Amino acid sequence: CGAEAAKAHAKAAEAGC
Amino acid sequence: CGAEAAKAHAKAAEAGC
Secondary structure, three states: OOHHHHHHHHHHHHOOO | OOHHHHHHHHHHHHOOO
16 A cells, blocks of 8 residues: 555656646 | 545545646
């Protein structure tokens, strides 16, 4: 739940949410 | 793992994303 959240958080900030 | 995180997810998806 910390690294799968971190990958989703970067995914948003990649295509800025 | 995240009902407060889900309330932030709905609050963003409404005004943020």
